Design a protein around this ligand. Structure first.
Ligand code: NA
Ligand code: NA
Lengths: 251, 251
């Protein structure tokens, strides 16, 4: 039995440390039902306050890290810096960084390798764009991303890896994803793991749905056999986040 | 008389919050001579501790910011977040971000516009690469960068703008820059400002040397008529930083 996993990705929000602290206080009072692993990802500059104030049964995550321990990389934040605060998680490969910030698969593989080799746990994001979706080539595209990922995972570190599927074809495109879509692609990913690295690893790795998750669809999505949780966007800034965390009882 | 200006760019250093706090304590005990404006730029995740612990007669700076107030930009830090801590400065356009992180001039112009329109002061970086240097086309190249910058500066905000010249042709290239080189390019920049936006603005804007600045060359460089200070790299992590700040007495 894989522990249900819910990551709250604040993205570049909120605007002020005051709003962040109010948000934390909200999360600290939330009543979690069932068995669920909860992680909260926030902007770098809010990480210290999050680590300090967030309920200790949840974990803090970065939204990105660089490839090196330190050095001449103006503007970048590195794994050692994050760890020095006691922070154990980072998101990698989010579609927004792949797209807006031009992060390619080689950059991302290097990050996953460095992060894991340095004691961190990763939420690794993948997902196909509209054209591959419409061509019926989603599985091929996603497979290539996972294959670029796999060689970065050090032996014995798959327990520290969580994979999130983003239906990029449904983000800002005029298309929406169904519950069945989410299940199908999470299954696609799991089968890729089983074929490439073995059933034992495939059965243990949490695969999350990273599309639009809201209180109105989290229960239905949670029930999908291959969906082990969510990487939540907007709802993670709202009270609806606890409903999403509690969707685990339908999984 | 332009106030001498020294920015300490920690870049992606140090590795741990503990090292950062020790570094701050060092800077807090430093005896500054003369008249000099001091700014210290650190990784996002260290900004809160810096803002809190750094001597109040110096100012804290980000090493980068995004183009938007907030939103779906996983991994990015924004102007409002930084300001919510009382932080007033950011570096923009550093060669390492232009090169490694692929930031282009349009991205950078947008950042300068947004930052300044939102109450922040900027250290805007420019500088030509080896090929333009060797072709004797440095001034042409740098002019293009400044021209892309100028339309972003809102009326009445040139007092909030500092420009740093990076001899990228001398960074990781096997070539070294002389004191005369620094002076020549700082002058080039000032003349570009005078021609494009007027002598009054050109006479007020601080132009910094962003090449290799160390205790062994800061006095000589400081004396250069058009060099109003430095954006310091490695030395800003060392005790030699105070020598650099104190070089102002030779300007
Ligand atoms: Na499930
Ligand atoms: Na001078």
């Amino acid at each position: 039995m894989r522990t249900f996993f819910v990551g709250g990705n604040w993205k570049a929000n909120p605007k002020t440390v005051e709003e962040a602290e109010k948000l934390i206080e909200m999360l600290n009072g939330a009543k979690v039902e069932g068995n669920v692993e909860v992680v909260v990802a926030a902007p770098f500059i809010f990480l210290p306050t999050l680590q300090q104030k967030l309920r200790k049964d949840w974990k803090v995550s970065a939204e990105n890290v660089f490839t090196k321990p330190n050095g001449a990389f103006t503007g970048e934040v590195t794994v050692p810096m994050i760890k020095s605060f006691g922070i154990e998680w980072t998101i990698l490969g989010h579609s927004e960084r792949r797209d807006i910030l031009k992060e390619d698969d080689e950059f991302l593989a290097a990050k996953a390798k460095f992060a894991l080799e340095n004691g961190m746990k990763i939420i690794y994001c993948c997902g196909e764009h509209l054209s591959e979706r419409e061509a019926g080539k989603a599985s091929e595209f996603v497979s290539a991303q996972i294959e670029k990922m796999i060689p970065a995972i050090p032996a014995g570190k798959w327990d520290d890896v969580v994979i999130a599927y983003e239906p990029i074809w449904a983000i800002g495109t005029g298309k929406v994803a169904s519950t069945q879509d989410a299940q199908e692609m999470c299954k696609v990913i799991r089968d890729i793991l089983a074929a490439k690295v073995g059933a034992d690893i495939a059965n243990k790795v949490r695969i999350l749905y990273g599309g639009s998750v809201k209180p109105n669809n989290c229960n239905e999505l949670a029930a999908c056999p291959d969906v082990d949780g969510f990487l939540v966007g907007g709802a993670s800034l709202e009270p609806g986040f606890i409903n999403i965390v509690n969707s685990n009882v339908h999984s």
